[PDB]
Amino acid sequence: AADFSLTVLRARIALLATAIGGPDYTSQIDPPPYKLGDDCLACLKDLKRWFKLVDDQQKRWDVAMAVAEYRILTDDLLPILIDWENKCSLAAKLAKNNPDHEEFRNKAYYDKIALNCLQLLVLMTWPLIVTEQSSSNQITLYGELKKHQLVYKKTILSMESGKVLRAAIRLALDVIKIDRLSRTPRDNMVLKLVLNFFRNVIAIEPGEFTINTKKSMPKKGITSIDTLPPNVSMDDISLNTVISSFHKNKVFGFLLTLTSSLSKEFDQDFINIPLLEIMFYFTKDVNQELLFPTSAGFELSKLLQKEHQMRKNVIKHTSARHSRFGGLLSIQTPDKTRLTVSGSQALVDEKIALQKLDDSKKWNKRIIKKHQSVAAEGLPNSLLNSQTGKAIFFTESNGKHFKEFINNFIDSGFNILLHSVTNYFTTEQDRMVTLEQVEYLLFFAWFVKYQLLRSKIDNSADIKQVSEALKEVTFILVSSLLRSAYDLKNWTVTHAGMIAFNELLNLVSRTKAAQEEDSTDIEFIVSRLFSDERIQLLSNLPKIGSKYSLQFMKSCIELTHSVLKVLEQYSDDKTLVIIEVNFQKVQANYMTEPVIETYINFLERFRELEDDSIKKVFSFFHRVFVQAKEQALLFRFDLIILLREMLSPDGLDRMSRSRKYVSQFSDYFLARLKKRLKKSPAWFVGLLFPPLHNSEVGFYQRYGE
Amino acid sequence: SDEINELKEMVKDEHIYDKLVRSIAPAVFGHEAVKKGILLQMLGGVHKSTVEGIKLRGDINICVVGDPSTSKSQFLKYVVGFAPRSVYTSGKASSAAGLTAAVVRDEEGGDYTIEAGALMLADNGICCIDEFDKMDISDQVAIHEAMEQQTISIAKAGIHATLNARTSILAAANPVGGRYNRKLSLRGNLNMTAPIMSRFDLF
Amino acid sequence: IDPLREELTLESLSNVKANSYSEWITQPNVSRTIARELKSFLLEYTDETGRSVYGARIRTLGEMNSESLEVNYRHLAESKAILALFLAKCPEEMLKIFDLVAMEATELHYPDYARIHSEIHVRISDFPTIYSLRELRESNLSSLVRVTGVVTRRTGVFPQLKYVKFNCLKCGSILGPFFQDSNEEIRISFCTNCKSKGPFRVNGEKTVYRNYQRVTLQEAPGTVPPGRLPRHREVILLADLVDVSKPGEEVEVTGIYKNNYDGNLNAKNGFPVFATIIEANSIKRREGNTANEGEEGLDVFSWTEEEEREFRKISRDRGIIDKIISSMAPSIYGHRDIKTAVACSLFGGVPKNVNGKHSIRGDINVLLLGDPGTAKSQILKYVEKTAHRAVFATGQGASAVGLTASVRKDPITKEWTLEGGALVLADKGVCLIDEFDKMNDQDRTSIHEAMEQQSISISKAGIVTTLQARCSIIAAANPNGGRYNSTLPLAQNVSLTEPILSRFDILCVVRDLVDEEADERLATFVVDSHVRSHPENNARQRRLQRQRKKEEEISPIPQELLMKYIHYARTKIYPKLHQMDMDKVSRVYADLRRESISTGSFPITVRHLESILRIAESFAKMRLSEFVSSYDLDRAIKVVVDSFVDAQKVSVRRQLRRSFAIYT
DNA sequence: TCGTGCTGAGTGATATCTGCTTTGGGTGGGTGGGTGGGTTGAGGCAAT
DNA sequence: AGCAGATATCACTCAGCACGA
Ligand SMILES: Nc1ncnc2c1ncn2[C@@H]1O[C@H](COP(=O)(O)OP(=O)(O)OP(=O)(O)O)[C@@H](O)[C@H]1O
Ligand SMILES: Nc1ncnc2c1ncn2[C@@H]1O[C@H](COP(=O)(O)OP(=O)(O)O)[C@@H](O)[C@H]1O
Numbered sequence A: 001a002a003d004f005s006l007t008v009l010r011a012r013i014a015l016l017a018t019a020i021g022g023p024d025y026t027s028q029i030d031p032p033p034y035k036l037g038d039d040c041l042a043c044l045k046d047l048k049r050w051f052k053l054v055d056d057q058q059k060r061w062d063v064a065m066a067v068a069e070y071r072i073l074t075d076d077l078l079p080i081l082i083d084w085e086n087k088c089s090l091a092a093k094l095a096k097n098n099p100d101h102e103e104f105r106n107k108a109y110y111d112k113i114a115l116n117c118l119q120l121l122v123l124m125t126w127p128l129i130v131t132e133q134s135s136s137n138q139i140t141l142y143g144e145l146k147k148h149q150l151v152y153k154k155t156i157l158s159m160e161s162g163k164v165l166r167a168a169i170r171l172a173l174d175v176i177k178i179d180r181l182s183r184t185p186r187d188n189m190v191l192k193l194v195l196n197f198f199r200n201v202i203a204i205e206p207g208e209f210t211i212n213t214k215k216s217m218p219k220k221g222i223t224s225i226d227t228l229p230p231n232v233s234m235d236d237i238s239l240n241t242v243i244s245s246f247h248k249n250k251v252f253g254f255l256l257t258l259t260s261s262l263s264k265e266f267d268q269d270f271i272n273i274p275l276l277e278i279m280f281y282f283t284k285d286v287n288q289e290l291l292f293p294t295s296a297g298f299e300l301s302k303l304l305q306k307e308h309q310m311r312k313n314v315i316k317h318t319s320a321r322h323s324r325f326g327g328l329l330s331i332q333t334p335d336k337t338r339l340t341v342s343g344s345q346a347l348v349d350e351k352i353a354l355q356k357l358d359d360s361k362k363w364n365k366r367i368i369k370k371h372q373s374v375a376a377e378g379l380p381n382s383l384l385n386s387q388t389g390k391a392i393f394f395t396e397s398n399g400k401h402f403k404e405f406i407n408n409f410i411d412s413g414f415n416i417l418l419h420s421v422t423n424y425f426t427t428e429q430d431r432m433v434t435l436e437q438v439e440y441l442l443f444f445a446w447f448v449k450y451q452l453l454r455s456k457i458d459n460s461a462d463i464k465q466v467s468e469a470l471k472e473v474t475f476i477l478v479s480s481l482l483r484s485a486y487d488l489k490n491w492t493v494t495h496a497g498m499i500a501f502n503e504l505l506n507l508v509s510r511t512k513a514a515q516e517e518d519s520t521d522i523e524f525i526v527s528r529l530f531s532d533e534r535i536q537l538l539s540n541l542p543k544i545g546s547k548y549s550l551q552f553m554k555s556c557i558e559l560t561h562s563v564l565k566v567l568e569q570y571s572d573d574k575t576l577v578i579i580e581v582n583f584q585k586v587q588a589n590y591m592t593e594p595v596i597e598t599y600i601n602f603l604e605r606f607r608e609l610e611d612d613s614i615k616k617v618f619s620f621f622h623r624v625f626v627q628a629k630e631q632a633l634l635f636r637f638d639l640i641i642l643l644r645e646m647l648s649p650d651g652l653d654r655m656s657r658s659r660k661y662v663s664q665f666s667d668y669f670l671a672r673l674k675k676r677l678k679k680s681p682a683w684f685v686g687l688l689f690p691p692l693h694n695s696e697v698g699f700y701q702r703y704g705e
Numbered sequence B: 001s002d003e004i005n006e007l008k009e010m011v012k013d014e015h016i017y018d019k020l021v022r023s024i025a026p027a028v029f030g031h032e033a034v035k036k037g038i039l040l041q042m043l044g045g046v047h048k049s050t051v052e053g054i055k056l057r058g059d060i061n062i063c064v065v066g067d068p069s070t071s072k073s074q075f076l077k078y079v080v081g082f083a084p085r086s087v088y089t090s091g092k093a094s095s096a097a098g099l100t101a102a103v104v105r106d107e108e109g110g111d112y113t114i115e116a117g118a119l120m121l122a123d124n125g126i127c128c129i130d131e132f133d134k135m136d137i138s139d140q141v142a143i144h145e146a147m148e149q150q151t152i153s154i155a156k157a158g159i160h161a162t163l164n165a166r167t168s169i170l171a172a173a174n175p176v177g178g179r180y181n182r183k184l185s186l187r188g189n190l191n192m193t194a195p196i197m198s199r200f201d202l203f
Numbered sequence C: 001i002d003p004l005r006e007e008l009t010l011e012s013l014s015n016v017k018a019n020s021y022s023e024w025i026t027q028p029n030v031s032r033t034i035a036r037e038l039k040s041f042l043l044e045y046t047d048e049t050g051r052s053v054y055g056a057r058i059r060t061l062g063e064m065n066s067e068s069l070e071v072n073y074r075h076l077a078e079s080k081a082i083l084a085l086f087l088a089k090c091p092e093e094m095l096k097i098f099d100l101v102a103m104e105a106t107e108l109h110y111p112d113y114a115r116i117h118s119e120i121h122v123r124i125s126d127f128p129t130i131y132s133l134r135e136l137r138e139s140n141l142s143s144l145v146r147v148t149g150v151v152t153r154r155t156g157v158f159p160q161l162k163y164v165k166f167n168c169l170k171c172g173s174i175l176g177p178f179f180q181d182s183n184e185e186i187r188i189s190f191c192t193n194c195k196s197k198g199p200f201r202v203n204g205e206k207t208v209y210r211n212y213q214r215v216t217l218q219e220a221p222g223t224v225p226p227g228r229l230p231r232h233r234e235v236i237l238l239a240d241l242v243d244v245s246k247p248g249e250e251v252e253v254t255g256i257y258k259n260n261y262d263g264n265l266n267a268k269n270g271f272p273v274f275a276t277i278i279e280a281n282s283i284k285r286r287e288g289n290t291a292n293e294g295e296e297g298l299d300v301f302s303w304t305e306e307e308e309r310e311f312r313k314i315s316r317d318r319g320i321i322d323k324i325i326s327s328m329a330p331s332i333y334g335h336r337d338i339k340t341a342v343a344c345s346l347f348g349g350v351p352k353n354v355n356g357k358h359s360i361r362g363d364i365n366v367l368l369l370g371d372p373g374t375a376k377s378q379i380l381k382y383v384e385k386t387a388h389r390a391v392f393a394t395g396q397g398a399s400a401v402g403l404t405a406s407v408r409k410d411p412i413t414k415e416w417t418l419e420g421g422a423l424v425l426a427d428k429g430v431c432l433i434d435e436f437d438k439m440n441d442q443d444r445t446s447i448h449e450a451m452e453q454q455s456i457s458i459s460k461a462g463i464v465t466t467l468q469a470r471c472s473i474i475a476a477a478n479p480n481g482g483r484y485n486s487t488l489p490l491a492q493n494v495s496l497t498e499p500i501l502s503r504f505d506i507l508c509v510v511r512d513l514v515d516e517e518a519d520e521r522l523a524t525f526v527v528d529s530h531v532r533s534h535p536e537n538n539a540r541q542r543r544l545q546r547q548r549k550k551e552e553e554i555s556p557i558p559q560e561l562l563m564k565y566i567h568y569a570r571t572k573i574y575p576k577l578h579q580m581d582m583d584k585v586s587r588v589y590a591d592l593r594r595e596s597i598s599t600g601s602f603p604i605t606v607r608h609l610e611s612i613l614r615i616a617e618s619f620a621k622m623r624l625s626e627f628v629s630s631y632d633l634d635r636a637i638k639v640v641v642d643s644f645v646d647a648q649k650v651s652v653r654r655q656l657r658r659s660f661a662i663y664t
Numbered sequence D: 001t002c003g004t005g006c007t008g009a010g011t012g013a014t015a016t017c018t019g020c021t022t023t024g025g026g027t028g029g030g031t032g033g034g035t036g037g038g039t040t041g042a043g044g045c046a047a048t
Numbered sequence E: 001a002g003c004a005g006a007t008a009t010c011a012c013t014c015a016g017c018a019c020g021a
């Protein structure tokens, strides 16, 4: 029944694959040229019909697996496209030699075959998304099809140095050759097909490792999480290879040409969204700091020295003699009871003895983490879930090419693209799905931040290229998106809106720094954006941040920092009217036990953060402790333990400004804590427990008076 | 390219043949007659096989006889350190193998095994024997087949094999008496029998 | 049209669309195409003659009730290159399809052959590439290889389960039969129905068994580098392949290079290293066939029906015996008396068993006692090449139990066991002992029982057994002093004793005398032969044609045809004596005894009358005749009398020749 | 936006039962190996 | 007797709502 039907399907698709065509070995010329079969176009049409009538309408993916099994793509479609592109190039060269010279027959048929091949390529390379309603067959074939997609991408980027990209560019230029008014809907569909092909090629990436949870994990445990096919390495599918291929095949020039003449010589409705998606997939995994840094040897020496210092600090925990030397220690508690520890370090040191006592303990309190698979929502891997510090290692030439492409785009058409996208989306807000919201917000944030960084580095290129972010249409769109995401409890869109808002606040701060008189119109924007509801929302974000992932926390922290920065600067500069803004009221709004908790939680992970995150956290702490005089908040034990960890020799490198901040804060905190303890012995007990909420005594606790 | 020019220059010389004879074992003094024999042995002869699997030898065997302290050993020493494949041995071989092959069994269970000999090890080369006039009886009979058939045939308990021995023997022997007696013929001065004496190409 | 029944074409078959060769072959349509093409190749292939080679091969296969069809790799490669490539790369599935297509070509000729043998195996004969056990690497895994070596160790033939049936311990359901790999065990972990972690008792109502054997292949001494330890592999012999290779032999093995997981290997080495084996596909007996490596086929001594007709046509010729004698060692100039004896020994006599009580030897022994340079070792080498089973030994290189049989302790079972020797290996063959006179007395004495009783008796370490040694012995010896003294009697020229001398049927004394005409002729022939053999002096067809032209000069019969003729005559011809002159033979024997009464003369006994009869039988056999004729008896009498006369002294040789002129 | 239960099913975890196998010795074998041990006595073989 | 794998029955965490403050 089902198995027999699967066998028939596989046999029929295998016959189709063998009937499409193959290399002609009769000719003595080597390497042999690909030869089209008698019914090549009919075979491609039949394959498309199979795709339509089996893969989609019956909600299965057996056709794609059958196609991948018999290598229909890597052996038939790509060679056909490459050969057609080479024929067109030869024809162009002949025309250059003599315009009347022609070496083409059945040109219409060849173009038809090429177009059908490109359509089938887009069909096979379309992103795969698994939902809750997906059938059992669709769920079961996810990983294998993702691996086949990885193979497809590797072949596309490698074969003939990626000439199928040039074939697609030629197909698009065929449509570009006719005027906008003369452009039929078919031509616009072809353009959208080419753009979708490029987006799919960039998007593909390794999938997730899905494991059944029915049974508690065995005593063996997890071996490894590998989704790569047998003969595919991360070097083949990395963005580095994509950049190399695009530069070699002049894809960047075609995209720049499309995005520079956007909304002027083209129909924007077809092209705006594909360009936005292409650029988001381009710049989703790229950190902008890396783009503005032999030097490799110098960095290697510095890293080796860092590891040497870490090893030196580790050495104090190792015994000079072998393990079986057998030294036994007895340590006396304040009461006359002796505890036993083993190890030379125990005898020679006391802190080591207590650390070993702690470490030796078997019982662990359960830690429950709320993990959400990104594949569940259909989103791709991006900055939201990528671990902080994950760096895309570009080569020098590839990095230069990517920077040049981004700079040209930002100086050519970022303004127009943002305007068109914002208009189209605000016209059709409700139809938005989570993917489109995240995509728009992340693209906006990334490009704004990159322009800010380049403006800082280079005095020429300036904010006027990204000035369209300031305009109120985009601002209100972003605000509505973030607020709705908050209200509906959609945390991923919340995160994206958070990032976008942080970038917008940094931008507005820079514009105000530029010129005040020209920034009166931006004082208007500042007044609009700091609306009481918005204030409330922004304040609430941190309080909830503690529940979610690390990245959530970091975005919360950064947005808080930006909000306080703008609030203080604009209160000092002039008066603010939303309802007048009382900076102290907001500040106070920011002072509660959840916020602090959040901060603490974020700081616990200090071995992965940079110095900027620590600087922001301790700036907040300074605001709390000194400016606000809300010291009772910080008289906790989580902070004390974490600060011991930070200041310990094994925790943080001595030669670091972060350690300077930590040491200064620790000095001040210890001084004030000593004063409080001298005043009220009760605080010794108090330290252990959350604040009291008692009318009688609450004040006393909080402020000591 | 430079080596090719040198090669063509040598063959162009009119007196090339004389020079090669004079360029063999330059340490030895005034023994051009022996040098010519060694040079020809290194070049060897064409190896041929008939149309029914009968092999015709193409290797040259040389035996040198002389009084003590006549540079007999020096000739063998030069050949050992010059020819590609070669082995230096003596008739009174220490090893249980000797000149020819021998069979050794690891004690118990383990079956009989073949241990290579002087002639075996020098396959496709030149085997230099220091004292041919002191070879073992076993070797003397055994060496009959090696010098002509170029093979060693053994049939011992549980093991039987034919071993390739395509070598050229350059042997040095002392006269049967203290010194070479000119009055007697070469046969009288040598302990070697008629069969072995026929297998040597030059004396 | 059912898609599973559609088929591609050959050019489309060449284009591969799968991830591996095995996946491409296993596909239904590809499998059908391969089977159709193999059937077409089997049915339609034609040789230079123009007749279907494999049709005749199948006819012979059915006639002999065999289950192995031999297919030459070169034929397939020329006819279908792609199929040959597939067979080289994926031997397993290709061999399965080839076996199926062969039982449909056999069944085409014999419709009800399935009632004789259920399945038919295809055996590849001449794989173009030959490897050594040292040269094997990981790139040869799961591919056909051809290796040579020595059969050091052998097991007994065991029945192996073709199909294994499993039943659940708990549920009790019986799983279907499963194919048993030759290499390693088949187990079921996950039950389709029960889904039980627990093991399955292995039970079956009816199981089909298969012959199984394993051998220890070792590098041959000839091919191993001198002074280096040999390398070895384990060869697995399946049904119809068992007992074909006997311990101590030299064979060429065509098989599949396979690897499997070995726990103890991993444990010992400390690395993830996989054990390796060879699944034998075909075996070729290379023992004593070093000079026959230029031919094709698994057996060079086998014959076809057309070759049998050619043998009959050759035999019908009147002068067949003269041509056969002239074709013995064509490169040796003369010695027409050493060639006649060698031919007679090669063909041999007919053993007899009178009423089951009297056993008479039917083999001829020859001894060559001659001068140092009279081409004796070359004659022995030629006899080794021509004989179906030959063993070569040297004087002192042979021990008393290296010949005959020897006793050892088995490494595995730790028990005394019996091993064969030179004689054993030469059963129904020839044993050649060069340098006979240099043999140890002890060594020499060993063969006494073997040379007449045709049996070996061993009483050692509690082993009481009698073997079969039906081997003829041809030996070369040098007279005492290194040169024959024609003046002295034969006995004084050699150190052998009366029994050993009497056991030799024919004595050939070779003398080296200086003569102008003889020296001139011999030198001319030797120079011509040397020039003829100079290495410098279709492509395969052209090479064969030039080789044939070179051979025609010195031999009236092709050498390979001669070997096939000798094998056929030995196997299928048993002449008998019914009409013969009793008085002639009796008088010849009496005269020989009377002349041999002289002291020191060549011994004469009833053994030599029986040798006369044996030589007559051999001469009759040379013509493929079923009955001994008077001419053959006269020729045998002449041979024996001439040998006896030549063995005498110079002084009395003239008188002896005059006396015996009547018979010769 | 704190405090105090009531509900709750999910995500554990740890207190709790079900089947080998072993020593060494042929009362597990030689398709587990002999470099994981046993192992002194007789016997046959080659070099001597 | 001891050891390694497994079943199943034992709690505990975050989840969220009704009252009132
Ligand atoms: N013609 C010569 N030219 C140079 N040195 C010679 C000559 N003849 C003899 N000698 C010297 O004789 C010394 C001893 O001779 P060598 O070691 O070659 O063996 P041998 O004594 O001739 O032989 P054996 O060991 O058989 O008695 C060598 O060191 C060599 O220097
Ligand atoms: N009658 C002959 N015809 C052709 N060649 C001969 C003849 N006699 C001797 N020879 C050559 O002389 C050599 C004799 O050596 P061989 O016979 O091996 O020595 P032995 O006779 O001691 O065994 C061979 O290489 C052979 O080619």
Ligand SMILES: [Mg+2]
Pocket: B072, B073, B130
């Ligand atoms: Mg010396």
Ligand SMILES: [Mg+2]
Pocket: C376, C377, C434, C435, C476
């Ligand atoms: Mg000889």
Ligand SMILES: [Zn+2]
Pocket: C168, C171, C172, C173, C191, C192, C193, C194, C195, C196
């Ligand atoms: Zn079951």
